[PDB]
Amino acid sequence: TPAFNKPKVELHVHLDGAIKPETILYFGKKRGIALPADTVEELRNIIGMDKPLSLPGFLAKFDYYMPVIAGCREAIKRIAYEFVEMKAKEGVVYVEVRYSPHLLANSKVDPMPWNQTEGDVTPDDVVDLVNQGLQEGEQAFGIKVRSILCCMRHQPSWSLEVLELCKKYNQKTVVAMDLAGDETIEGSSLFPGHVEAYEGAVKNGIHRTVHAGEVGSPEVVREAVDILKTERVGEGYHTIEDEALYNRLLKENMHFEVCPWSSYLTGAWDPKTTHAVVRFKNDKANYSLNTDDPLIFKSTLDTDYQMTKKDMGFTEEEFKRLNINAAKSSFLPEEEKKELLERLYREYQ
Numbered sequence: 001t002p003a004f005n006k007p008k009v010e011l012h013v014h015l016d017g018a019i020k021p022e023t024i025l026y027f028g029k030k031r032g033i034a035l036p037a038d039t040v041e042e043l044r045n046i047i048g049m050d051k052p053l054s055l056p057g058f059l060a061k062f063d064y065y066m067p068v069i070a071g072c073r074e075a076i077k078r079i080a081y082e083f084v085e086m087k088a089k090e091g092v093v094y095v096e097v098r099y100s101p102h103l104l105a106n107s108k109v110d111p112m113p114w115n116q117t118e119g120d121v122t123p124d125d126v127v128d129l130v131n132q133g134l135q136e137g138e139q140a141f142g143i144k145v146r147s148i149l150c151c152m153r154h155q156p157s158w159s160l161e162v163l164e165l166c167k168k169y170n171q172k173t174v175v176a177m178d179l180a181g182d183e184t185i186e187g188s189s190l191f192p193g194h195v196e197a198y199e200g201a202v203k204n205g206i207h208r209t210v211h212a213g214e215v216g217s218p219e220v221v222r223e224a225v226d227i228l229k230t231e232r233v234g235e236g237y238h239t240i241e242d243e244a245l246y247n248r249l250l251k252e253n254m255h256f257e258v259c260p261w262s263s264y265l266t267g268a269w270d271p272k273t274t275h276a277v278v279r280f281k282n283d284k285a286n287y288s289l290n291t292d293d294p295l296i297f298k299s300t301l302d303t304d305y306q307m308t309k310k311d312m313g314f315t316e317e318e319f320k321r322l323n324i325n326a327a328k329s330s331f332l333p334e335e336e337k338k339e340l341l342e343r344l345y346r347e348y349q
């Protein structure tokens with residue numbers, strides 16, 4: 001009994017955070033790379049988390065499996081492909097998947113991620129591989145999928161390249177640029193590489209989303225919006241702590257990419273306090289309900305819907321409304337955007 005058994009739109013999910021334990025297991029064995037377990041079940045209990053940790057502590061879960069995927073062409077395309085499939089089954093009609101092309105490369109990247117031996121999978125090659133998998137997947141499960149390339153807070157040296165990859169693969173799945181990573185890295189929002197990359201995104205008409213305010217303060221959100229010119233705020237829960245800023249974002253109709261389950265599991269949200277999404281729903285704000293990293297949170301899109309339904313009083317009417325807003329707030333070109341809205345309204349009848 002799903003919380004909302006109707007078409008959905010997801011704008012916030014990490015491809016490298018939405019991998020099948022069976023695929024991880026498969027490639028570790030296949031490449032002879034170690035994993036903290038050799039059973040999907042125990043693989044899930046190590047990578048997985050059922051209790052709040054922290055953002056820095058949550059991010060380390062990737063260390064367990066990224067090494068078996070990164071640098072492997074077969075694996076990069078496969079996870080991209082199986083991702084669409086996972087989305088198709090969850091009832092998602094349109095989705096934007098994000099990831100760092102750099103963290104999956106083993107050539108032309110410095111610092112080499114995961115202590116990898118050089119190879120031929122360049123960062124560009126990664127975008128191409130994911131595009132291919134995503135495309136083959138759309139085709140096969142019939143849902144529309146786009147992608148978003150992440151700048152990493154800790155590695156601004158990579159940012160300007162990410163912008164280039166967005167320019168090159170514009171709408172050839174790549175519809176936007178994100179800034180992900182450890183939001184606690186003081187000043188990461190302001191590092192030159194990042195700033196210069198967004199400045200060029202603005203100048204070259206490349207869409208922009210920025211993770212901010214999940215654990216950072218209103219100023220991190222203020223900087224994303226004002227300095228980085230972000231078009232959407234990834235999560236942004238802490239924005240409501242600055243009534244003035246909140247109201248100005250509410251006025252611009254800023255889209256907040258919300259991830260309920262994720263906010264609890266990363267300790268971003270104090271379970272004793274009311275979720276910022278309650279305030280969002282109440283203020284009729286522009287916001288989507290997203291999954292973020294389902295492999296690590298051991299969840300599905302329904303997990304976040306059941307959470308809001310059961311615990312936050314969300315109705316089918318709010319569910320329909322938030323998704324219509326997610327559609328309007330997507331980085332799809334006008335025509336495809338209209339086509340998306342058309343489908344949702346058709347099905348919401």
Ligand SMILES: OC[C@H]1O[C@@H](n2c[nH+]c3cncnc32)[C@H](O)[C@@H]1O
Pocket residue numbers: 014015016017055059062098099100103150180181182183211292293
């Ligand atoms: O998917 C791109 C990267 O964004 C980061 N990311 C994933 N889930 C996240 C939640 N919050 C902040 N950053 C996240 C991860 O380091 C992942 O490797």
Ligand SMILES: [Zn+2]
Pocket residue numbers: 012013014180211234292
């Ligand atoms: Zn995220």
